[PDB]
Design a protein around this nucleic acid. Structure first.
Lengths: 148, 105, 60, 344, 267, 443, 93, 35
RNA sequence: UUUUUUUUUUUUUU
RNA sequence: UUUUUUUUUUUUUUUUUUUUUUUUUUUUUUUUUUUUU
RNA sequence: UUUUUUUUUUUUUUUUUUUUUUUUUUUUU
RNA sequence: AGGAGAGCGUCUGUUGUACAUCAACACUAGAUACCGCUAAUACCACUGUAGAGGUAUAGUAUAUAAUCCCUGCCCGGUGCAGUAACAUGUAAACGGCGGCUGUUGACGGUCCAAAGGUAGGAAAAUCCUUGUCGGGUAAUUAUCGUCGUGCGUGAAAGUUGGUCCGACUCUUCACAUGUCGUUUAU
RNA sequence: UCCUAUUUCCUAGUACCAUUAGUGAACUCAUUUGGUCUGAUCCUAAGUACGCAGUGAGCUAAAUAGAUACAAGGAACUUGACAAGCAUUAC
RNA sequence: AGGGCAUGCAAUACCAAUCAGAUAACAACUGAA
């Protein structure tokens, strides 16, 4: 249900991770990076890599993969592959919905200040039922039976 | 039924290639999207946070040990004593604020 | 009717039964009854030096 | 909460809280006298605080006093989308009450009995467990004599029908007090017999002029207000005696009180508490109420009313669950001698 | 000694596994989190760090009352070090002398010279109030809010902040043998100042070493502060070392430079 | 009761966060353990007061006090010096047991005061026959820590140890050997005898736990004979499991030095044994955090001003290099100090000489810079630059390191005192330049 | 309650138009440590209210009984205490 | 037995009730050893 | 719901 | 608005508590009283 | 990784169980 | 689980029932009665606890049911309140409220009583299992509208009801249909 | 000599007890093949670059429990529209 | 009975007002066995 009690935005959250307000500066800060004088403290890279991901904005070019050490996900990695960006069961026409238990499409539209929903069985075919529902909504809008 | 049939043939073919030990090549074309939730992106943040936490804890321990040692270093540590004797600074018995001198006790 | 060893042991155990206003004279397999059981019998023709009879009254 | 030995007391040997500062009690006495004279010098008003004066002051306070015309656009958290519909009534900088949390050092957990006595049986019927509550440490005794205190903010008391106020003394100690309808954040109060007749000020009955609106009247010397504490309630001064003060309560009852006891001047805050209309049973469900079942719909053994069907009628007087009449039946010990009660 | 005693790792309670619902709790636990402590509390906590400021706040009246209001506010707390190293010796000594004078006046109270003292205190109190109040800014401005405002999140403006590289042959010869041989954002004016405050961002020195120890996917192309972090926020050309000090009244940020108004600035 | 929907959400998210946080803390915690061990079979039963009148104190009392101070880490100059003064007075009434305690305390505290060591040594020398294992071990252990070589007495200590071998402890015996090898006071015959006794001791009354302590690169290549070398090397492999990084490092070092110095003995080892060491090197061995010294930094600044590229700190397989040039990696510098030489002398230590020779063998253009020579320059930069430049044009040091000229306590003290003020003036000058001081207030 | 001396100030709402004043505090307990400790201990003794109770000692004491009219519950038989019913309930006797 | 009920009961061995009977395997008339 | 040398004890807090 | 957590312990601050207390394990470093800065 | 132990929190004793056997002249090595 | 007329009607929520097969309880609201602190009331170890660490805009008890609507008469009567130390006041507490006869009949006689059904609804959750007339059908006694006599109900006992609303009876319209005359094949 | 101070710190061999790490209601109950199927999550999946699971033989009788397709009429059935049906058909 | 004889049955009762537990500062505080 689209209840008030829900976030207004649907974007991934990357909240700030502030450090304790009583700790001193890290150890990695004592490094001389000058071309002439070079100084690499112990665990310099270890500390700096972690420290860089504090802000939350500087997630890096490859964020999903710069922290997943587990091989489970790496094993599945692929290169040079085209992928879609839309779920199969998502029609672009407004008012269309799909029900998993009923296994059927529904169309919501308002007529004369009253809510009405129609059934669309998808047993004969997913694409056929989806197109039938989209055509029904378009016919509603064309004939002018939807309030505006 | 047809999809469960085609999957088998595909898998069989791929397995044959793996057995053969041929170079790993796949169908580099437009794949569908059966997923809906951004599980990978949502999952990365937890590891980031965890890492942060770990780092913090490390820092805390480092600081604790350094702090404990610093005070023990030579030339710093001293048997500090009060300048004025505490007895003189002690409040008198007739002080109105002394315990047992007001009808509240 | 659930199975709860905690409940069972906290309400029906050896230390919980003693607090019960029951007839303790009845013999109990898994309980501390108070029924006397008459002990070891008389002696026949064995060695007299090896016949045991007492312990808590004789411990030293 | 506290122990019986720590909470129970009949006789009181003190009516004030003394906090001397000089090394010697001889100097402390002079300091106290100087403070009393300083408060006496400052006191200037001596007229009775009547209903008409109250009204006139309220009209001025709620007609022209409140004018800031502020730039509320900048007073907000930038970059916070917030909820998808859920918004507060008003921002914290324009609300009547404080948008925060009660003080941690001035509160404690509440022990919910659920209307049950020691025996474990239900004693009080129709008693639910609503929203969590915290017991407040309300300072009923004005022990702090000859000292001024300014109001910082006003708080909400779930346990009371009136609002509270955060009082801060010059020394910097924080304390809770019963607020008034007139008192606003910034107003100053003082507890002393030499103080003026103003809202919030606490003075003896005897010192209080006649026909003066008062509240938080104490029964015994230095015990605390018990006779009137609820919102919108107040008492009036009728008569005066050398040792007694005649007061008219909120229930139209005339009673005499000691001349030594303390009392506050003004009206309890939140006068409009009896105007809310609950739109649904959910309000009662959250407040900690339970459904009430009439006895009429009960069995004869359960209730006398049971079985016997009938409308209003005039033959057989009704009987409660306890077997006692509940219409015009006085419930008071006839033997109990009337005390300071004049007119009941 | 109960039904179950497992804790920590072995939590008997069952939690949701759905990433969609999990993504909503992080927002509530980070952004909509409530704080009991006030701004003054936060300020006091770092009294050691900012003694000058800590003392001025409690010394000059008015500032304490102003910094206790329910309305949202943003505060900057310059460091003692910053003050010391920025301020000239004469100005620092003069400021300390007046702070001590006010403290001595209050100590005397609690414990034509008479006419001159009133004028001196009246002028010094106004000067210090003006100085102090300059830092205060209406509204709540978070580190992330500022960062994003500065165009840190815009791909069209992140070109100078994302791709960073350095000579790897000079810092890791063993691992590389083949090589051997932003915009200005204007903030609302302060309480005691009409002039706006410019804010910008800059790239840190550390940011130019991530690729050497991280997986990068860059496309085909055709003094230095020691403070940590990939990005440095400059609020009016004062660097921020610490921030996000959320409170009941607003936010507090520690800057490495004392902001002084034009009214106090010399010719 | 019941909660508001708004509050419910926040509380649940907060709770969840808690769980996440807790999960996120015990990551790096690997080597921890709830259970621990504390040594308690050394404290005395009698009670004493450190803050008491030293005059009323006795040998027993003072002995106790010294050790209690050390254990409690009550580092007080005013307190320690009184102890030393009273000890000097009561030097003629100290039991062997008491002396040992005193020594242990001093050593544990690292109280650098030669005046007391020098005064207590002769009395120890006379009471050597009545000495015991514990006393004998503590003497040497303290001496080693404080870096005060005494070849006259240390040798005697060893000889008494050998005489009382039948009564000594394996641990103390091992530590004595170690100490002796580090101090460099054992002639060939003594060395041989020590080795022969050590082998039997190790093979008869040593376990996994006790054996690990016998591993020392400095000792192995200068005290130990081939027969003991081979047995040590072979048993290390078997006893490797029950070890620590500190012993691992030593083992590796030993291996390296053996390979570099004694090809024959190295070849005499077995294939299996060899493989162990081969594979060992490939592993990552943890190391403690390190940073440049003030002397190091001053030298580095002078070098950089001269116009030469180099590094501050870096590891090279098994050896640390002070300075390494980028244009010519072959080149390297080493900054010495007071600790690099024995007390009141300029003689290099055995570990310093061994590390110098190992790198010289391996082909490292090694240069050394002393501190007593450096201090003389004062706070002048041109003089230091010229000093460095004159060194650079000269050939490197020989394979075999030599000792410096004679010195004295007086000179040492003087030098130290002198340097004290230089290190402070340079810091003040450095720190002052960082302050812009631009802002001017009208007021 | 006595707040910390390093920050005696507390949050408050905006004062109305005609309030002004806002006098400073009087921190007289920061001159000595013992004075502050004694002041806190004295403040810790303060009470809220005094509750009365029945006492036979007093000349005007009394107790309560049953409600006027007697009566009772609807179809309920109350069994009185005894040595064989509800024995040893909240306390021994 | 519940916690509330169990918190107001003594042990049976705390009394003399255990030495006021003669129940045994033989019967109802038990004679103690050495009687 | 307390994380690495053990106890006693005071204020504030993300 | 139906008005919501804090004690054991951690950090910080303030100190005249105490072997009921951290290897007699180990490394590094120019270094410390009074009659050498 | 838990259990054990402080707090919540309870002799609201989980028979044959425990850091729990008489409680420091402990021979410090 | 659709379009239209009409009867009844605060649900959401709890549950299988006070008769003839067609229910209750709870509730937003209003109103009455008791009680000034060691309050009333409840448990019924009585110097106890809950109420309540509350204080007449508070606590508890009884009955009714929408936010509004104009809301009738009667204290002879049990009881309570009061005291001539047994007038008088309480029907939103406590049972209820009618005969002969004369001109369709405003009106006249007489008996009795504290008062002598108010208005509204009205073939009804009630009389009667076919009251007159009109709308639908080839037939309507079923059902809506209406008349107000045939018997009768009856106003904070809750009557009537504009608008809105519906898992509440019934009339009636539309698509498909083996419900069907009347039954087949896989 | 322009760093926010150039302030040594990997890791002590470690008491007693719990544990079959995977799918599956694995709990009371019992007509108990433990594991397949019957419902949401946990993997950016052409169903996861071959995963889990599947128990005697024969035969056109009729009746009964269900599925698909029925000429014309379309409530004439039944107390009652119970039941059944519509919601897929040029692509 | 020469010798030996783990553990559990909650034990200062070979004595001493009563009321929890290794048997409770007064008082609150009560009683048919």
């Amino acid at each position: 249900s689209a209840n008030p009690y829900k976030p207004k935005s649907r974007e991934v959250f990357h909240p700030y991770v502030p450090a304790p307000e009583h700790l001193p500066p890290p150890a990695y800060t004592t490094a001389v990076l000058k071309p002439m004088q070079q100084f690499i403290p112990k665990d310099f890279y270890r500390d700096m890599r972690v420290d860089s991901l504090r802000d939350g904005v500087s997630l890096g070019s490859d964020f999903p993969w710069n922290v997943t050490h587990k091989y489970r996900f790496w094993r599945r990695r692929k290169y040079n592959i085209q992928l879609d960006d839309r779920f199969i069961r998502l029609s672009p026409v407004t008012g269309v919905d799909y029900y998993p238990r009923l296994n059927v499409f529904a169309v919501q539209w308002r007529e004369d200040g009253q809510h009405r929903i129609r059934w669309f069985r998808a047993a004969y075919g997913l694409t056929r039922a989806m197109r039938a529902a989209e055509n029904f909504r378009k016919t509603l809008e064309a004939t002018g039976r939807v309030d505006n | 039924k047809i999809r469960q049939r085609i999957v088998r043939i595909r898998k069989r073919y791929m397995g044959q290639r793996i057995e053969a030990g041929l170079p790993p090549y796949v169908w580099g074309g437009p794949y569908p999207q059966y997923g809906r939730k951004r599980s990978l992106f949502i999952r990365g943040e937890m590891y980031r946070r965890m890492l942060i936490y770990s780092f913090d804890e490390r820092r805390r321990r480092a600081e604790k040990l350094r702090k404990r040692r610093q005070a023990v270093k030579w030339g710093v540590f001293k048997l500090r004593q009060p300048s004025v004797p505490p007895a003189l600074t002690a409040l008198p018995t007739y002080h109105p604020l002394y315990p047992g001198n007001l009808p509240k006790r | 009717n659930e199975s709860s060893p905690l409940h069972m042991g906290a309400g029906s155990a050896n230390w919980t039964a003693v607090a019960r206003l029951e007839d303790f004279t009845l013999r109990g397999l898994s309980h501390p009854p108070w029924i006397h059981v008459s002990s070891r019998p008389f002696y026949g023709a064995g060695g007299g030096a090896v016949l045991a009879a007492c312990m808590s009254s004789a411990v030293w | 909460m506290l122990w019986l030995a720590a909470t129970h007391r009949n006789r009181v040997a003190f009516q004030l809280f003394a906090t001397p500062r000089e090394p010697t009690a001889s100097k402390a006495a002079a300091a106290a006298r100087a403070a009393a004279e300083a408060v006496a010098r400052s006191s200037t008003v001596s007229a009775p605080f009547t209903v008409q004066k109250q009204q006139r002051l309220l009209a001025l306070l709620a007609a022209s006093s409140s004018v800031a015309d502020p730039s509320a656009d900048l007073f907000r958290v930038h970059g916070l989308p917030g909820f998808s519909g859920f918004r507060p009534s008003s921002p914290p900088h324009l609300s009547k009450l404080f948008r925060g949390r009660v003080s941690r050092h001035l509160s404690c957990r509440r022990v919910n009995h659920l209307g049950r006595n020691n025996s474990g049986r239900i004693t009080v019927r129709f008693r639910g467990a609503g929203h969590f509550r915290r017991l407040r440490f309300v300072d009923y005794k004005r022990g702090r004599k000859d000292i001024f205190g300014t109001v910082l903010r006003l708080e909400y008391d779930p346990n009371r029908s009136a609002h509270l106020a955060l009082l801060q003394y010059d020394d910097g100690v924080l304390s809770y007090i019963l607020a008034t309808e007139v008192t606003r954040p910034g107003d100053r109060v003082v507890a002393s017999k030499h103080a003026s007749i103003a809202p919030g000020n606490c003075l003896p009955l005897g010192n209080i002029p006649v026909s003066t609106i008062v509240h938080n009247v104490e029964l015994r010397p230095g015990a605390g207000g018990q006779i009137v504490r609820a919102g919108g309630c107040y008492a009036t001064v009728v008569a005066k005696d050398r040792h007694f003060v005649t007061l008219k309560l909120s229930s139209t009852e005339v009673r005499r009180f000691p001349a030594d006891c303390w009392a506050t001047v003004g009206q309890v805050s939140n006068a409009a508490h009896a105007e809310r209309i609950r739109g649904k049973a959910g309000v009662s469900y959250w407040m900690g109420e339970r459904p009430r079942t009439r006895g009429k719909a009960m069995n004869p053994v359960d209730h006398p009313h049971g079985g016997g069907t009938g409308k209003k009628g005039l033959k057989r007087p009704p009987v409660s669950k306890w077997g006692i009449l509940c219409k015009g039946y006085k419930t008071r010990a006839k033997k109990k001698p009337l005390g300071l009660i004049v007119r009941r | 000694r109960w039904w179950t005693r497992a804790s920590g790792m072995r939590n008997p309670v069952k939690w949701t596994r759905d990433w969609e619902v999990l993504n909503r709790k992080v927002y509530f636990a980070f952004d909509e989190r409530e704080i009991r402590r006030s701004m003054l509390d936060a300020v006091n906590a770092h009294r050691k760090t900012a003694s000058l400021f800590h003392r001025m706040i409690n010394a000059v009246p008015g500032v304490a009352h102003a910094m206790s209001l329910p309305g949202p506010h943003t505060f900057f707390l310059p460091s003692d070090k910053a003050c010391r190293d920025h301020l000239s010796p004469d100005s620092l000594h003069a400021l300390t002398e007046r702070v001590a004078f006010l403290e001595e006046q209050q100590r005397q109270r609690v414990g034509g010279t008479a006419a001159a003292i009133a004028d001196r205190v009246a002028k010094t109190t106004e000067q210090l109030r003006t100085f102090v109040l300059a830092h205060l800014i209406p509204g709540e401005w978070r580190m992330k809010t500022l960062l994003l405002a500065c165009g840190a999140g815009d791909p069209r403006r992140n070109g100078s902040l994302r791709y960073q590289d350095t000579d790897r042959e000079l810092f890791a010869p063993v691992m590389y043998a083949s090589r051997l041989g932003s915009s200005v954002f204007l903030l609302p004016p302060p309480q005691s100042t009409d002039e706006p405050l410019p804010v910008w961002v800059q790239a840190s020195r550390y940011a130019a070493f991530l690729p050497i120890t991280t997986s990068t996917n860059f496309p085909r192309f055709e003094r230095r502060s020691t403070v940590g972090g990939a990005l440095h926020l400059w609020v009016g050309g004062a660097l921020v070392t610490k921030g996000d000090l959320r409170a009941h009244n607003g936010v507090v940020h520690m800057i490495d430079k004392p902001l002084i108004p034009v009214q106090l600035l010399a010719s | 009761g019941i909660l508001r929907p708004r509050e419910r959400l926040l509380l649940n998210a907060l709770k969840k966060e808690a769980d996440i946080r807790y999960r996120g803390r015990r990551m790096h915690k690997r080597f921890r353990s709830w259970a621990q061990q504390r040594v308690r079979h050394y404290w005395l039963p009698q009670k004493v007061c450190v803050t008491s009148d030293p005059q009323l104190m006795d040998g027993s009392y003072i002995a106790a006090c010294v050790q209690k101070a050390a254990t409690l880490r009550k580092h007080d100059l005013q307190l320690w010096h009184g102890f030393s003064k009273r000890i000097l007075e009561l030097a003629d009434s100290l039991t062997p047991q008491q002396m040992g305690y005193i020594f242990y305390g001093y050593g544990k505290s690292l109280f650098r005061h030669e005046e007391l060591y020098r005064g207590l040594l002769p009395f120890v020398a006379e009471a050597l026959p009545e000495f015991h294992s514990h006393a004998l071990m503590t003497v040497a252990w303290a001496l080693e820590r404080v870096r005060v070589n005494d070849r006259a007495v240390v040798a005697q200590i060893a000889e008494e140890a050998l005489a009382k071998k039948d009564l000594m402890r394996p641990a103390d015996f091992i530590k004595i050997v170690n100490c002796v090898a580090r101090m460099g006071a054992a002639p060939p015959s003594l060395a041989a005898a020590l080795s022969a006794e050590l082998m039997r001791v190790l093979d008869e009354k040593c376990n996994a736990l006790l054996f690990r302590g016998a591993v020392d690169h400095v000792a192995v290549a200068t005290l130990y004979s081939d027969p003991l070398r081979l047995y040590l090397l072979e048993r290390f492999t078997k006893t490797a499991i029950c070890c620590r990084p500190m012993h691992y490092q030593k083992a590796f070092q030993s291996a390296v030095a053996i390979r570099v110095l004694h090809p024959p003995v190295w070849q005499q080892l077995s294939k299996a044994v060899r493989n162990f060491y081969i594979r060992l090197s490939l592993r990552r061995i943890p190391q403690r955090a390190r940073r440049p010294s003030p002397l190091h930094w001053d030298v580095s600044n002078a070098l950089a001003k001269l116009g030469v590229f180099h590094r501050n700190t870096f590891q090279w397989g098994c050896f640390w290099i002070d300075i390494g040039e980028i244009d010519d990696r072959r080149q390297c510098w080493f900054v010495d100090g007071p600790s690099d030489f024995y007390s009141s002398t300029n003689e290099y230590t055995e570990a310093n000489k061994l590390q110098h020779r190992i790198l010289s063998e391996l082909g490292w253009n090694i240069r050394r810079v002393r501190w007593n020579d450096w201090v003389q320059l004062g706070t002048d930069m041109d003089a230091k630059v010229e000093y460095l430049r004159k060194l650079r044009e000269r050939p490197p040091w020989p394979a075999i390191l030599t000792d410096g000229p004679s010195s004295s306590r007086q000179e040492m003290v003087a030098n130290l005192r002198s340097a004290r003020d230089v290190q402070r003036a340079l810091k003040e000058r450095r720190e002052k330049n960082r302050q812009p001081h631009s802002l001017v207030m009208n007021l | 309650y006595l707040p910390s001396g390093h920050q005696p100030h507390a949050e408050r709402q905006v004062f109305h138009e005609g309030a002004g004043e806002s006098p400073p505090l009087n921190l007289w307990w920061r001159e000595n440590r013992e004075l502050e400790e004694a002041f806190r201990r004295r403040l810790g003794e303060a009470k809220c209210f005094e509750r009365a109770f029945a006492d036979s000692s007093e000349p005007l004491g009394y107790t309560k009984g049953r409600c006027r009219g007697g009566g009772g519950k609807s179809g309920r038989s109350v069994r009185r205490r005894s040595k064989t019913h509800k024995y040893r309930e909240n306390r021994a006797f | 037995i519940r916690p509330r009920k169990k918190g107001m009961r003594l042990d049976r061995r705390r009394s003399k009730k255990q030495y006021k009977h003669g129940r045994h395997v033989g019967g109802w008339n038990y004679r103690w050893l050495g009687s």
